[PDB]
């Protein structure tokens, strides 16, 4: 069914027309990336369903017939810079085959300290870095006691 | 060593490190600034580099008063730019141009005996706010350094040509008015420039009575030979069965001259 | 007293993690002088700064193809001298496990070996299952290779709901893919023709030479540990023994696949026999007791407290125990002086004593066989270079 | 015919090439390169097969076994005497005496030639071979096996 | 002159992606960390799907990964076959005993990390990391040299 | 193996799109499609009489 | 005109030998249980793009201690010979067309050699001369096996000759052995399992690598060209590709041999065959 | 090539056919059947080739000096290579014989050759020169 | 088959034994003779026109129209269960305390040496830690940590794509671990209440 998956690829792409998609710069990019364009164009693309989708935007399918090891997969938004640290913990473990719960059919305990999951910043100059770094903003001396001063 | 299109001898020379003591004092918790320039630098020569780099000196001089100056010659290195461009010049060239008699005298130096010397400015207070001279325990005119490198590297061919200082400019002259509006190309050594003959003309080496190795307590490294030599060496891998060379008897086993019979 | 005078041939093979020096006089064979210790990691030393417990992640990395079978040497060796007797359902565990870890080894040793002779679909498609069977280890101790999951009186955890399934599963097709490994080097004339009758070795060479496993049986050796000296529940499995008597690659080759299929089975007899009962010793001042058990109760909470600082202290004495190892026989001897560490921990491979049999093996050879030698010869640095 | 006529040029420049150097591995190469450009000129004279012949004899055959003898009996001894010791003054004259000036040529007293392009007949040379000079190719088959069984006598073991 | 500099910020592109897609390392199988190191190869993670192909020499060896520990005794190979890897080059560091000695971190004969010998440019931690976490790690080497500029700097210099 | 397919389908392709061109080249170059076949001493007289005498035809045609 | 000939020659063997390998990969794969390189472009298709373009980015370096002319020349004159016989099989009309590409094969075999001796490496001068015997060793069979089909080749004319033009367009279904026995001598001919033991260019890097890959997949075709014509009954792209599918599918599922071993069989099983074949067709066309 | 007198042009005179063969263009339907003349040419631009490919990643590759980066990480060959010159010599005789329609009698002197080689391969062969031990 | 044959035996002191000597024909492992001419025919099929390759090619042909089990990475991920053991990780207590108390059992457990830890009381007379680090490059994810800790502070994530590209980056230091800790918690404690039915 060609009209079925085109509008799977639509509503995959997360664009508006096949010509919005074809002239996208995601599209020339999938040009370049195989696996990009492998997840744009033939998982997706299967007998499955959606999932649901996270606060980043990613969607997530499952499809039961597929064999084990291969029944789940995501798409993520970030089209140029995909990565998966962005995924968040919530559907971490129904993507790492570990437990068999998600949002959309597990209701958890959010606590109020709970920091949201995003990008790494590796390789960045605003990464972590210890306390006894030059990159820190107070450096640090570790003596382990008070020098005398007149 | 190279002039550019995006940069030029007085904007890397001068302007920069002006700007940068300036700040340097500006900080006020710096105590020592470290500044190089080069043995044959002097505000009266035709060279441009060499008087950019005597004007930068005096202008980090006046702008920080504590500021060393290291004025070394010739460096000698694996990945040195005087050893490394004469063997691009001896080898893969059909023939090697020396400026008139090449006579003139210079007094190459190596890299550690430098870094030993840095250890030890930052060690002695009193060399803040001076000029230290840096060279190698001999003199020599680049004749005899092209004939010492011609023994090590064993060629049976002297490539090398003496030509007037004009001549050289004229095969130069060409690559040198084009040198700017170009982004910089690749394997250019830094001998095909005017500057260079200009320094072929005038003696490089110590002044007398400028601050040296002894002042630092360090006795220079023989550059002639020694563990210095080893990485030139290898262009010629020491000595096994390279070249035809037959003057080599010398250093020849035993044995193996009897089979020769010398 | 020696000279050098005549230099002549000479050769290096390989800083790479074997180093071989070889002499040949042409094309054959005359001397080979393996060096070794690029690995040699002073692990013997270094256990002596740690407790018992603390040291057992030291035998994960000994061979770290095969982990289980080098943790239940030293179990046993602290055991023995700890007067510890082990639950049956532990000892189910221990075996069935066991054998999974030494369908692995052969899994790994065989497709190592085609890679080297030249054969490559083996290798990826045997590899599969063992990542099915690194699932299986991760779903019990949460690591793929180094578990730590054998324990002094029993193991770390009790076997996840479920598993069971997936290893019958497992089994039930592990003989198909088996099957299919076998036809690509056993009706092959090549495959023969590189490994028939190369490296010979004969049972009163290799009782001199203190060979184990598979190579000792390729000698028409009646030899199993699991048979003669058994432990665990080793004495109820009833299986087979692949026996040889050539000594040679194609035999041990065989030797090793007929090893796999007896591990099935024993796989498929442990599968129909677990009990249902305690896992670990009821020592609790040995064993460490149950997390609710500790949060619950002083007397529990002491223990963990004083074994996981100071851990028990093994009576003052010696032993040495042995295990069958999928590369031949494991041994480790105990030194107790009656403290939390071990006095003196000697660790025995027998890698080891194979890799010392090149020089004999490869004279009259040829440089096409030496990669065959150490192929068959089935060793890990780690555990010769300790 | 500027370019055919350096190429037969070219031959003699090697040949003497050939003797010149002191690497064995060169003088080798000069003589393989020699080899070709000869099969290659005498292309010109339209002998197809023979030139392959020559070509696959002497590169496949002879100089591998060339470079196989000086690969393991030749440690390199350039230095020993080959660049030192020189070369004999009466050999160089008494061959530019011969080739140079060249006062016994092949043709003697004719001094011009005319070169024309043949016509190779593998039909007919197959004629010859096996119907004018039989007797000569089954000499030629036991000179080969005198080759063989000489080798294989003469082994060093 | 803003053309040119298009033109050059396209071909840095061209050549990060060139290079990115293609890196080949080169296999120490020193300790544990390899046997992961060849399951990533295998079919369940395809290494070789990812443009990733192990060498036997160090000469068309790309980059460098370490799986396994270091000892004194082997420094010298390892750093004499990091110095014979050509340029561009990486390192890539896998597992602790490649990243601080960690289990062995006390002995008297490792290497306390590769890097106090060779430089490396991505840590990949795990005793032993996931297949898949060598996965990441690589991707995360391809991410940065996709930030890498080198024509733009040179057209600047 | 649907993932070589394209790889096994793109190298016909390229060989039979090189194959083209070369015939279509070699066929404008040579003017006929047999210039591969076996030829004596007699064709290539035949051939090179036959040159001769087109050059001699525009030779005469450049005389009316 | 020649010149734009050579080069439109030129172009399909590059970008046909970069597919070759790429699938050779796949296919691998697809007999492994894998997929192979699919991340690098559509489906992988661009694999050996990169792969070529990144070897030539990457630094060459040359031993000091050897004569590095010899090393550079290797690679470039094997390559050469396999433009050479490119040319010879599309863009030639020799009379023994077929010699001519049998004694341009049996160049090939210097370039191994030269990089053995160039090369200060024990293993790499012991594997070469390994190499050369082999393929040495099988080039008097593959000589037989096109003696035995050149009794049967003529032209209309009533010439016998070796015109790839002029061979007919119908498989030999009477030189069935002798064809299995030239296949297998072609396996040998390319290093390719089961003959797979020697590599010589351990030492060697970048684009001289490339060229040495260029050069071996490059002789593998024009070796698949020469049985296609032979016994196929022609030339064309489908039984390159399939003859390259089965090359793959013998180097997926065997195991090489050693030395002596191919030896022997080369030299007691393989030629004495083909001496036998050579004259039973030679009795029989009489 | 160019002809250099009329009876090399079949006796045909004027100016225009000698300037015409002075830049012709090549054609084996032409002046140049057999002529084996683009092995030459093609020659020439494999040559270009491949130099340009070896000086290339000397440009477009970055450099640096170390010294341990300059460094690399019997008879049966005489029998097999003597053997295969004697059996090439043989093979290139045996080849016009296969070139030609030949008789009775010319098959027996083939035959006759090929017993003699024959003779003297199995005679190698029965004395243990064909089993490379050594 | 594994049965063995005449010439074929890759040596020469047992294909020089076998060729002057019947000793193979005593061992039965050796395929018997051939008797009559079906028996050679069969031999000659054996040897000759392969026959052996031929099964092995075509077991891999079938390969090649079968199924694969390869994965899209990082668009799909493995199978993993709760007893992971990956980034080390401190946990709080719901009202948003941490579950850590500085008893240094995980210190005093840690064969790695790995941890260090510097502790005092809190303004508030709580025992809390002041220094808590552990050395990621240093640390062999033994997970024995997490064994002995009794109030269930320090944990070994679901976290292990945690590269960084330079060592430094992997120095854990408390705020680190308490960030990841925040992070991973929903997950870490979903993992727990299935762990606790076995730890
Ligand atoms: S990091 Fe751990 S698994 Fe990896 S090599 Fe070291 S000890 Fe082995
Ligand atoms: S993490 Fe747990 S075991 Fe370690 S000091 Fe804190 S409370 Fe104690
Ligand atoms: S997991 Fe093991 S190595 Fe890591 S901190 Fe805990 S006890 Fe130490």
């Given at each position: 069914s060609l009209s079925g998956y085109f509008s799977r690829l639509l509503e995959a792409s997360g664009k508006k027309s096949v010509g919005s998609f074809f002239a996208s710069w995601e599209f020339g990019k999938m040009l370049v990336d195989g696996n990009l364009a492998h997840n744009v164009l033939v998982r997706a693309t299967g007998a499955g369903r959606l999932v649901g989708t996270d606060y980043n935007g990613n969607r997530y399918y499952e499809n039961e017939e597929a064999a084990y090891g291969r029944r789940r997969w995501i798409v993520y938004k970030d089209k140029f810079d995909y990565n998966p640290t962005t995924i968040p913990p919530e559907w971490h473990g129904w993507l790492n085959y570990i437990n068999d719960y998600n949002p959309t059919n597990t209701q958890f305990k959010q606590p109020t300290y709970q920091i949201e999951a995003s990008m790494t910043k590796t390789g960045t100059q605003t990464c972590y870095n210890p306390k006894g770094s030059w990159f820190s903003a107070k450096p640090r001396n570790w003596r382990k006691y008070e020098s005398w001063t007149p | 060593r190279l002039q550019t299109k995006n940069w030029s001898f007085e904007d890397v020379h001068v302007d920069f490190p002006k700007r940068l003591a300036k700040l340097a004092a500006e900080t006020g918790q710096v105590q020592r600034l470290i500044h190089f320039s080069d043995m044959g630098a002097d505000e009266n020569h035709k060279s441009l580099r060499m008087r950019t780099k005597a004007v930068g000196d005096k202008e980090v001089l006046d702008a920080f008063p504590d500021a060393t100056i290291v004025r070394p010659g010739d460096i000698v290195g694996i990945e040195d730019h005087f050893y490394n461009y004469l063997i691009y010049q001896l080898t893969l060239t059909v023939f090697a141009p020396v400026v008139e008699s090449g006579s003139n005298k210079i007094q190459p130096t190596y890299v550690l005996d430098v870094a030993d010397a840095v250890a030890a400015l930052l060690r002695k207070p009193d060399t803040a706010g001076k000029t230290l001279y840096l060279g190698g325990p001999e003199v020599l005119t680049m004749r005899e350094v092209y004939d010492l490198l011609l023994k090590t590297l064993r060629i049976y061919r002297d490539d090398t040509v003496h030509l007037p200082a004009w001549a050289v400019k004229a095969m130069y002259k060409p690559f040198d008015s084009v040198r700017r509006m170009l982004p910089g190309l690749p394997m250019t050594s830094p001998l095909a420039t005017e500057d260079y003959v200009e320094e072929m003309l005038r003696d490089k080496v110590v002044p007398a009575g400028a601050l040296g190795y002894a002042d630092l307590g360090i006795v220079p490294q023989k550059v002639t030979d020694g563990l210095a030599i080893e990485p030139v060496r290898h262009a010629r891998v020491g000595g096994y069965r390279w070249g035809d060379m037959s003057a080599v008897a010398k250093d020849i086993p035993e044995s193996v001259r009897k089979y020769y019979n010398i | 007293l020696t000279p050098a005078k005549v230099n002549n041939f000479t050769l290096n093979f390989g800083p790479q993690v074997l180093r071989l020096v070889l002499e040949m006089q042409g094309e054959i064979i005359m001397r080979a002088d393996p060096h070794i210790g690029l690995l040699h990691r002073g692990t013997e030393k270094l256990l002596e700064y740690k407790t018992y417990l603390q040291g057992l992640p030291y035998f994960d990395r000994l061979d770290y193809v095969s982990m289980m079978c080098m943790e239940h040497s030293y179990v046993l060796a602290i055991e023995q001298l700890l007067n510890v007797s082990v639950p049956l359902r532990g000892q189910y565990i221990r075996v069935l496990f066991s054998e999974i870890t030494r369908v692995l080894n052969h899994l790994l040793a065989i497709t190592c070996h085609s890679m080297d002779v030249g054969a490559l679909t083996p290798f990826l498609w045997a590899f599969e299952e063992r990542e099915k069977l690194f699932e299986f280890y991760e779903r019990v101790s949460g690591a793929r290779m180094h578990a730590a999951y054998f324990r002094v009186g029993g193991v770390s955890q009790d076997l996840p709901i479920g598993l069971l399934r997936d290893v019958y599963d497992w089994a039930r097709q592990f003989a198909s893919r088996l099957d299919e490994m076998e036809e690509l080097l056993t009706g092959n004339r090549i495959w023969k023709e590189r490994t028939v009758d190369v490296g010979t070795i004969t049972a009163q060479m290799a009782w001199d030479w203190g060979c184990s496993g598979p190579i000792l049986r390729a000698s028409g050796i009646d030899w199993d540990l699991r048979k003669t000296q058994p432990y665990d529940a080793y004495g109820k499995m009833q299986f087979n023994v692949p026996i040889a008597g050539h000594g040679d690659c194609y035999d041990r080759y065989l030797v090793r696949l007929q090893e796999m299929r007896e591990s099935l089975r024993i796989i498929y007899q442990c599968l129909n026999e677990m009990p249902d009962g305690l896992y670990k010793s009821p020592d609790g001042k040995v064993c460490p007791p149950s997390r609710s058990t500790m949060k619950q109760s002083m007397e529990a909470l002491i223990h963990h407290f004083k074994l996981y600082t100071e851990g028990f202290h093994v009576p003052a004495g010696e032993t040495y125990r042995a295990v069958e190892a999928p590369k031949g026989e494991f041994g480790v001897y105990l030194v107790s002086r009656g403290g939390n560490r071990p006095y003196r921990c000697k660790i025995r491979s027998p890698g080891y004593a194979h890799l010392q049999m090149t020089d004999v093996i490869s004279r009259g050879a040829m440089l096409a066989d030496v990669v065959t030698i150490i192929g068959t010869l089935?060793?890990?640095?780690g555990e010769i270079d300790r | 015919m500027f370019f055919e006529n350096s190429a037969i040029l070219l031959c003699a420049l090697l040949s003497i090439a050939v003797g010149y150097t002191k690497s064995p591995f060169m003088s080798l190469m000069y003589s393989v390169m020699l080899f070709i450009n000869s099969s290659f000129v005498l292309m010109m004279l339209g002998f197809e097969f023979l030139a392959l012949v020559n070509l696959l004899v002497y590169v496949g055959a002879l100089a591998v076994l060339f470079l196989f003898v000086i690969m393991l009996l030749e440690i390199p001894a350039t230095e020993l005497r080959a660049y030192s010791r020189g070369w004999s003054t009466l050999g160089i004259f008494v061959f530019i005496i011969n080739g140079v000036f060249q006062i016994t040529p092949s043709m003697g007293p004719r001094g011009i030639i005319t070169g024309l392009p043949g016509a190779e007949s593998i039909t007919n040379l197959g004629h010859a071979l096996y119907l004018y000079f039989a007797d000569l190719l089954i000499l030629n088959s036991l000179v080969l096996t005198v080759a063989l069984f000489g080798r294989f006598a003469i082994a060093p073991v | 002159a803003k053309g040119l500099e298009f033109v050059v910020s396209k071909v840095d592109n061209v050549v990060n992606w060139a290079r990115a897609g293609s890196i080949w390392p080169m296999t120490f199988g020193l300790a544990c960390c390899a046997v992961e190191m060849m399951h990533a190869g295998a079919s369940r993670y395809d290494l070789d799907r990812y443009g990733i192909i192990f060498r036997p020499?160090?000469?068309?060896?790309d980059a460098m990964i370490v799986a396994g520990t270091l000892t004194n005794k082997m420094a010298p190979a390892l750093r004499k076959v990091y110095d014979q890897m050509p340029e561009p080059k990486w390192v890539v560091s896998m597992g602790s005993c490649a990243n601080g000695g960690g289990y062995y971190h006390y002995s008297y004969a490792v290497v306390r990390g590769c890097d106090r010998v060779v430089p490396v440019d991505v840590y990949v931690p795990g005793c032993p990391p996931t297949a898949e976490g060598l996965l990441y790690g690589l991707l995360q080497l391809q991410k940065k040299i996709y930030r890498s500029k080198t024509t733009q700097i040179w057209y600047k210099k | 193996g649907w993932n070589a397919l394209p790889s096994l389908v793109i190298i016909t392709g390229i060989w039979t799109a090189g194959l083209f061109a070369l015939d279509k080249v070699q066929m404008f170059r040579e003017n006929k499609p047999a210039w591969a076949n076996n030829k004596d001493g007699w064709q290539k007289a035949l051939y090179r009489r036959d040159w001769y005498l087109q050059r001699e035809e525009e030779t005469l045609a450049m005389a009316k | 005109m020649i010149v734009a000939s050579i080069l439109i020659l030129i172009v399909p063997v590059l970008l046909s030998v970069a597919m070759f390998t790429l699938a050779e990969r796949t296919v691998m794969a697809s007999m492994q249980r894998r997929f192979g390189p699919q991340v690098s472009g559509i489906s992988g298709l661009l694999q050996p793009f990169w792969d070529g373009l990144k070897l030539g980015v990457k630094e060459p370096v040359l031993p000091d201690s050897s004569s590095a002319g010899a090393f550079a020349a290797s690679p470039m004159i094997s390559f050469v010979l396999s433009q050479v016989a490119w040319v010879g099989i599309c863009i030639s009309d020799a009379s023994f067309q077929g010699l001519v590409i049998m004694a341009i094969s049996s160049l090939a075999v210097y370039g191994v050699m030269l990089a053995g001796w160039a090369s200060n490496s024990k293993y790499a001068f012991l594997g070469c001369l390994r190499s050369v015997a082999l393929m040495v060793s099988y080039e008097l069979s593959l000589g037989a096996a096109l003696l035995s089909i050149g009794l049967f080749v003529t032209d209309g004319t009533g010439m016998k000759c070796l015109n790839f033009a002029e061979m007919?367009?119908?498989?030999?279904?009477?030189m069935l052995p002798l064809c299995l026995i030239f296949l297998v001598c072609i396996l040998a001919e390319t290093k390719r399992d089961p003959f797979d033991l020697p590599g010589y260019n351990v030492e060697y890097s970048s684009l001289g690598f490339a060229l040495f890959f260029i050069a071996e997949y490059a002789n593998m075709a024009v070796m698949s060209a020469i049985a296609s014509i032979y016994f196929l009954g022609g030339f064309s792209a489908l039984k390159i590709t399939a003859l390259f599918f089965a090359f793959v599918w013998t180097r997926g599922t065997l195991p090489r041999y050693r030395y002596d071993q191919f030896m022997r069989l080369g030299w007691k099983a393989f030629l004495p065959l083909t001496l036998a074949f050579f004259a039973l067709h030679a009795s029989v066309a009489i | 090539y160019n002809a250099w007198s009329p009876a090399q042009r079949y006796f045909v005179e004027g100016d225009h056919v000698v300037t015409a063969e002075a830049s012709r263009t090549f054609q084996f339907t032409g002046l140049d059947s057999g002529s084996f003349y683009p092995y030459v040419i093609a020659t020439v631009i494999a040559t270009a080739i491949s130099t340009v490919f070896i000086v290339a990643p000397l440009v477009i590759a970055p450099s640096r000096v170390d010294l341990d980066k300059s460094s690399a990480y019997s008879v049966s060959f005489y029998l097999v290579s003597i053997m295969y010159l004697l059996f090439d010599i043989e093979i290139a005789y045996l080849f016009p014989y296969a070139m030609t329609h030949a008789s009775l009698p010319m098959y027996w002197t083939m035959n006759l050759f090929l017993a003699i080689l024959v003779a003297g391969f199995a005679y190698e062969w029965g004395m243990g020169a064909l089993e490379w031990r050594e | 088959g594994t049965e063995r044959r005449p010439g074929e035996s890759g040596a020469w002191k047992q294909i020089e034994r076998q060729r002057y000597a019947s000793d193979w024909e005593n061992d039965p492992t050796f395929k018997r003779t051939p008797k009559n001419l079906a028996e050679v025919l069969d031999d000659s099929a054996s040897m000759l026109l392969l026959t052996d390759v031929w099964r092995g090619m075509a077991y891999t042909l079938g390969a090649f129209f079968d199924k694969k089990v390869t994965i899209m990475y990082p668009f799909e991920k493995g199978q993993l269960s709760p007893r992971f053991r990956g980034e080390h990780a401190l946990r709080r207590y719901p009202t948003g305390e941490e579950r850590c108390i500085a008893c240094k059992l995980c210190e005093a457990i840690c064969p790695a040496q790995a941890i260090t830890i510097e502790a005092e009381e809190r303004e508030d007379g709580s025992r809390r830690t002041t220094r808590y680090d552990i050395d990621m490059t240093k640390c062999i994810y033994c997970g024995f940590c997490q064994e002995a800790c009794p109030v269930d502070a320090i944990v070994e994530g679901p976290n292990f794509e945690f590269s960084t590209e330079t060592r430094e980056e992997l120095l854990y230091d408390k705020q680190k671990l308490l960030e990841n800790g925040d992070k991973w918690e929903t997950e870490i404690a979903t993992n727990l209440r299935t762990e606790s039915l076995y730890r």
């Open positions: - | - | 089935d060793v890990v640095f | - | 020499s160090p000469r068309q060896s | - | 007919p367009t119908t498989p030999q279904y009477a | - | -």
